[PDB]
Write a protein that binds this ligand. Structure first.
Ligand SMILES: COc1ncnc(NCCc2ccc(S(N)(=O)=O)cc2)c1[N+](=O)[O-]
Ligand SMILES: [Zn+2]
Length: 258
């Protein structure tokens, strides 16, 4: 009976195994754009993805991760609100059963169809596993998806999904360029928070871009054809794998723009 997204093991249940679920800096949150403070000391975000080396794509039973070689400084996030250098390890998405929901963060209570998470770890901690045990260990860049025009740079990901339909399947996934998933503007909001899945560790500086990317109806339909279950178990479509907004508690959201 492990965690998941259903009535009996979904987000309302997580605090039983992972008590920090009710902690002081949980994610996601609703971004109240009128209450977010413009911070003219915030730097432009530096996204340096020119040398990213993707390796593999994996269905883990919750989402699918595109994993990268993070054994060298190749795909790094820095500046913005960050001190130092954070290395890209994987990206994944959260999405809905319908285009009206699917994002984890919301903007003035608006849900988007999906949300992309590019996960990076602080190089001062030497690796991902050590980084998640630190309050400034990860920087996750979050990008909203709306449905409209296709995102050409996403198609390579959509086309490999039928090869990892069920939990525990993986495939070869080399030479994927994550620059193709970025909107034009790097204007962002930022706040201190957590992983949005168990173990829910409070180790994340969240950087959420204001500008969503457009993906087609066909592209997000292919996400919804994935499965939560393993091969040869009853089919449970992989949809609605998002945690809802959590209390802001004692925190400020900063804006990099007016
Ligand atoms: C012991 O090490 C680990 N310790 C904690 N969590 C781990 N896996 C969670 C990683 C994760 C990354 C990002 C997000 S989100 N949705 O907030 O972007 C959620 C979970 C691992 N690990 O399996 O390596
Ligand atoms: Zn995520």
């Amino acid at each position: 009976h492990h965690w998941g997204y259903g009535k009996h093991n979904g987000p309302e249940h997580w605090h039983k195994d992972f008590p920090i679920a009710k902690g002081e800096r949980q994610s996601p949150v609703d971004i109240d754009t009128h209450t977010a403070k413009y911070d003219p000391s915030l730097k432009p975000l530096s996204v340096s993805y020119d040398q990213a080396t993707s390796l593999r794509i994996l269905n883990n039973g919750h989402a699918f991760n595109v994993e990268f070689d993070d054994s060298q400084d190749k795909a790094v996030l820095k500046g913005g609100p960050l001190d130092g250098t954070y290395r890209l390890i994987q990206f994944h998405f959260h999405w809905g059963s319908l285009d009206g929901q699917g994002s984890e963060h919301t903007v003035d209570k608006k849900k988007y169809a999906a949300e992309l998470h590019l996960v990076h770890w602080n190089t001062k901690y030497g690796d991902f596993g050590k980084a998640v045990q630190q309050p400034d260990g990860l920087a996750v860049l979050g990008i909203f998806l709306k449905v409209g025009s296709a995102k050409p740079g996403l198609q390579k990901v959509v086309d490999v999904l039928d090869s990892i339909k069920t939990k525990g399947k993986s495939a070869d996934f080399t030479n994927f360029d994550p620059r193709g998933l970025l909107p034009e503007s790097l204007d962002y909001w930022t706040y201190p928070g957590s992983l949005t899945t168990p173990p829910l560790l409070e180790c994340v500086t969240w950087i959420v871009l204001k500008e969503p990317i457009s993906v087609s109806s066909e592209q997000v339909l292919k996400f919804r054809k994935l499965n939560f279950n393993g091969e040869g178990e009853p089919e449970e479509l992989m949809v609605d794998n998002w945690r809802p907004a959590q209390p802001l508690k004692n925190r400020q959201i900063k804006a990099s723009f007016k």
